[PDB]
Design an enzyme around this catalytic site. Structure first.
Site, PDB file in Angstrom:
ATOM      1  N   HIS A  28       0.836  -1.210   0.000  1.00  0.00           N
ATOM      2  CA  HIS A  28       0.000   0.000   0.000  1.00  0.00           C
ATOM      3  C   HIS A  28       0.858   1.242   0.000  1.00  0.00           C
ATOM      4  CE1 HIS A  28      -3.898   2.182   0.894  1.00  0.00           C
ATOM      5  NE2 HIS A  28      -4.138   1.345  -0.093  1.00  0.00           N
ATOM      6  N   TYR A  41       2.270  10.333   3.034  1.00  0.00           N
ATOM      7  CA  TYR A  41       1.584   9.154   3.533  1.00  0.00           C
ATOM      8  C   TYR A  41       2.511   8.399   4.492  1.00  0.00           C
ATOM      9  CZ  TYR A  41      -1.143   4.853   3.821  1.00  0.00           C
ATOM     10  OH  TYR A  41      -1.843   3.738   4.254  1.00  0.00           O
TER      11      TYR A  41
END
Lengths: 109, 5, 116
Positions: A28, A41
């Protein structure tokens, strides 16, 4: 300053082992590189759950990982929500996240 | 793991 | 840069805060700010952050996890095992924890670990 932050509590699917989940967190993260409208992120595992707090302990069950998104502005956030690759990224989230809790945060200082 | 602009 | 990468790899503890039942939201916000101010120069502590929970979106693409109402999120960074022990041994830290006892009703800690 105009920075928007959303923090996520992640629980892995019951169909996945802890190791399988760890590997999909890495996938991810790799997928997120250069995501439209995203400033930063982060995803990390929950390694420990101390219970000797000096105020009453809050049980929220078993959380397996913590994710966090930063957006530099409201405009960047809207670019992210309308991105096709962001939508495909969220589909991968459906595969490796069984349950999740989002918090939109506010800075104090 | 993290990245940022 | 290099700095943010190594910082991200520090010992980190993330906290879910719930305000005391009786304390107003207005006062809780002020005590969060006091708690951040008190963190300046805390022995062994590399960084502290405290933020309010401003939104609780429930339209998730993943099944939603209900954890009840969380009011703020706190996070501590320690650069090393030795610095964590300086902090744990510090009287200045014990005074900070006394302030925590005033404005935090319930607390969930997570010790996190890096991936890539």
């Amino acid at each position: 300053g105009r920075m928007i932050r959303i923090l996520y509590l992640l629980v892995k699917p019951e169909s996945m082992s802890h190791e399988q989940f760890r590997k999909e967190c890495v996938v991810h993260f790799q997928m997120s590189a250069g995501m439209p409208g995203l400033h930063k992120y982060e995803v990390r595992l929950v390694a420990g759950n101390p219970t000797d707090t000096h105020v009453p302990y809050l049980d929220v069950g078993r959380i397996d990982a913590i994710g966090e998104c930063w957006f530099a502005s409201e405009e960047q956030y809207q670019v992210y929500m309308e991105s096709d690759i962001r939508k495909a990224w969220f589909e991968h989230g459906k595969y490796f996240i069984g349950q999740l809790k989002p918090f939109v945060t506010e800075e104090l200082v | 793991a993290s990245w940022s602009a």
